[PDB]
RNA sequence: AGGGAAUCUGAACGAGAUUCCCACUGUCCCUAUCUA
RNA sequence: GAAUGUUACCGCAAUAGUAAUUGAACUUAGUACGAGAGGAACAGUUCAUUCGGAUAAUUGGUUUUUGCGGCUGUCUGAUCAGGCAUUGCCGCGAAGCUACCAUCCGCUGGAUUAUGGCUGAACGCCUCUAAGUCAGAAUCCAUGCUAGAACGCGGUGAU
């Protein structure tokens, strides 16, 4: 096999942490560098191909895309790291004073038995003109060469029966560390949307813990699957919206439909919020939390520069076989049934 | 040699030791594959052809004029489910191929039955001797 | 065939990266950061919904 | 084989040839054996080396023998042409020495392997192997002269012109430095010097031209006064199915008497008697009619400074060598000008469009803006093509509003009847 | 893009679903699922099997001859794209769908009479 | 690929194997006689056109039918 | 008027283009030099259409047409059919034809007055060529070569057949077409003469491997200069 | 670059003592060759 | 009411042997899944 | 997996491994170069082969969901229900698992080797080297990619 992907062992957690970040330019505006959601879905798209030099210039191509569900990420903190001869070293983290039920749930393994007394003295530590919070924020701005944002996911807006959101750390590639820590100050308790991180025609690297297959039998026997994998260069085809109906509508199809198939995806619900439709196949299975970083570097070929003109979204039944896009088209083709009249 | 433009991957249905029919009016009725020109190399894997690939093939049932000499053969019918870029998966009724010189010029004057879309695109003179495409 | 780490191809790709190939990414980034700045104002309106 | 021979594997100068074959047997074969091994592995070791060096020299020798053209088996022109440029006996002596040496090396290898299956020590076996390859070295050291000759012949035959003895040819002759160099200079694209001395040209220069849709080749010659350079010309006259264009300088130039050209023409007369001669002039005038006494001759007066009569000589030469309901055209095409490539003022093609827009494989051609519509505001076409399980193009016709209203009449004819209760 | 008919069902075949089969005669047999494809491979009569539409047309459980059904023609002579002549179709298709649904409902009532 | 009339098939198992299309032609008075039967309706019309889609049960639908046509002759 | 060009280094012009009296149809290759090859010689007089059939570059040996009409096969998408109508003038009609055979450039060899066809073509198209193109239709063979398009170049001025055509077949066939016919070649002895060159009443475009002795024959029989 | 294998400077005891036997052998030859 | 045809061996043979022709198969290309 | 107050979350990265591979297709071209026969290369773009990491949208495969249906036998005195058949047999077949028999993805900076050089001694010329110095391989080291020291460390929540 590949000797790089060793030791071929089970990961530390389902939420794999992002190993490296995109560099930094100290003149660029403040913007997030990685996003997270919940991968669950896969679907077929057709599009006309404006890729000149190819055998399919001004032709139409069918291809497989994946739908990661991405509820609006909520900022609950910021971390500052000093540059040492020993690597980086977190000197101060700061939180949001009033955090959701989801994250106070993340701080316990057994949620129901506890008195739910998580950040009581920390919120009481805030309870004045600031004084100590602004002291720690001065501490971050004075030192700390890089600044990373503590976020979490909106787990309840996702159909998952987990209730327990994931903490993460996302660096900022907007220059002047002052603007980093003050962007964070403008964003405590607030939420960050998907399309404020990504857009169409943008290459990303989705990282995921790879679908556990359990025990398996130099070509050696042992563990197969459940490894933390980084896959790079998956083009974003569509960023979606929850409130907006006709997400499944293209420039061509234009029928008022959601990208959610009939009876939803298999083993996972519908979509009730923002999503990213990424091309190809992201690692992990359905219901799996994926962390989407962006490219690391200027990765422009013509596979990264071209504009996607989506023509049609397959929303037919994945559970079973596909014959109808809408429920409306099932009973339009069928005629009327027994229990109808 | 002969192939026009780039060549993209379609599924492989015709390995070495496969008898396909002959489609041109040259004289041969069938064709026995012996080698595939421009194939990959694994351990223990047989050379497998597909639609629109020049193979080296011998006549088994046909005119003695077309025999005595192993000659290039371009496969025009596959019968194994390959994929088109326009959504559909398709396959034909039988395996068929047409005989030509190394340059890609046809010996026969007409090709019977359907000729594959990919094969007619890659080989120009096959599409010149084509009655039916797709 | 030239390798992935073939020096001449890395230099030819650096000739690319100082042209159109970065400029499109540096326009996309501005459109992403713009909508991020747009995401503050909506939430601030929903601050003023409760403040009303 | 055919006309020319550039494709010959190079000839190593017998010292380097040894340094190629012997070093390759040191690098490609295993080289390390203990004395403490079995005798069978010691035997097989040195056998493998004697044999491999055997195949080494033989491979290099076979490349020389098969590479060089079999002089007396090619073609009568080439058999004699190589005989003029090179001492034909020595050319066959050299290749005979290689054919001898290859059989020698084969004999040596076959000897010492047979002698090697009886070795009792590593020392004895080593002495026998050293004996074998050293003997081969001695054979190749005896080849320092013929291979030095074979490299020079390889280089000079690799640069020789390719005349075709079956295409329509025309020899260009006359005294050295008459002005025939200016003729081939002004008939075709071939750079031949018109330097003011006797033997400027040293070999047969070739010029191709096309007239009456046919491939012609005019062969320039050094000239006849005997030398290897001089006899090259004469045998080119003799063996080529051709017409000979003997050139004369009726002027103070050339530095030779015109009477000597008369003497030479009538002396060389026998071997060009079968070739239908043309003579071109570039008591006294009467001795031009003495040249006219030849059965097959024609006389023409020309000047190389003007470009018409030089062409007319060609015309007569080629002529000698051959004997030896209404259509629909739109007026938008008829009124249209021609495409001049070096014109500053013309329409820009798509070729120039893609250059101005940058690159070949990077520009995407807009299929739009090139098709005809009623309103060019809707030029950027979207066209839905599919709505709810049923494709648009199948539903798409003109007068669908009137056809819909016909179905609207068919609504009200079933509305009041009472089918919907 | 084309939404086709299944050779067995006459159900809508979307791009990237089922298999097209081509004979040595060379005609297209598009299918919506391997249920229909294996049903064709078994060399069955569709009009005998009840779950197809070919059965429902000839047996008359659904309607065959109607003015709404004559507009789903395989149309050949092409149009030069008028913004108005497409805007009219968008509302025409949504109109003819409503009328066809109401007519089919009326056909089901006229068939299911005499059961009450 | 072979095409014949149905009437050519009547006058002759061995026919059906090599064939692909039998053809319905109304201009003949012979077919007008064959049209007026309890046969040539209910699935029989489509069975004529697609001969290699049939199977055993639909072959016997034709082999019984031929003998009905032969008795009219 | 005899132009000598290539498409992506290819001598077979008729495969990758269809050229008539009122229009020129070209494939969308990466290189625009083939489009500019006609735009140099024809200009803005007759429309040159950037087009595809079924997403194939091989247009000229897939389509049929003259000054009056244009025929495309079944495989032509409604987007390509929309595109051809938009690009073309209203004097020229367009109709998609459903058949056993799809390579129309090999089946319908025609000019503005006459047409030769494959002997095994259906009756429906035989009465459709007569209507849309308005030309006389003949189920005629060229020396046992069943495909009439690739082995016969044709115009209103004259025609060109493959060199294996008999003298009896020349006299018999030219009696049908009423134009002078010469058995000749294209692209240094290529037998495919229909796809080796495109032609109309005022232009003949060959491939860059067509030798001048053949080019003089082309210029003669089509009567350019 | 791929740095190739380095020769040892550890002389094994078999080598070292064999060196002494080979040396003393060279002596016995040199004393005999001195007489001629 | 599994073939067939030759040959070597003691004209068919005998589960004799070999070779070829035709058919068949996961033996393989290349494994995949299920049950005990 | 005990231990270093407990307990939880977020981390850092010493160290160890590491991976991509080769083929041709279009312009560049029928230009350079060429008597001709022929006939390139960089920059731009497009595929494929082998190898690896994945993934199941579709296709094919697969079925003790033995899911539904059909056939043979067998018992309740007959219908229906099934008891039953060493899973009796046959067709289809979800979920799951799966196949170059399916699909996706697989990088960019410094230091160098041979070599080509600059300034320039030794040696009142010279000299790519001696002191210096620029370029330069699929090479090396990093970036990236994988594990995290259970006796390496850090920051943060909880009395």
XYZ file of N, CA, C and O (backbone and C1' of nucleotides) in Angstrom, chain G residues 8-9, chain J residues 26-27:
22
model
N -7.308 20.904 -37.246
C -6.512 20.240 -36.190
C -5.493 19.240 -36.781
O -5.306 18.139 -36.252
N -4.840 19.663 -37.869
C -3.970 18.821 -38.716
C -4.701 17.609 -39.328
O -4.330 16.452 -39.090
P -2.464 15.624 -32.713
O -3.227 16.969 -32.319
C -4.598 17.197 -32.707
C -5.176 18.399 -31.992
C -4.573 19.750 -32.346
O -5.152 20.284 -33.531
C -4.782 19.566 -29.991
P -4.217 20.814 -34.719
O -3.218 21.808 -33.976
C -2.916 23.114 -34.502
C -3.274 24.183 -33.495
C -2.261 25.307 -33.358
O -2.510 26.320 -34.322
C -2.881 24.529 -31.206
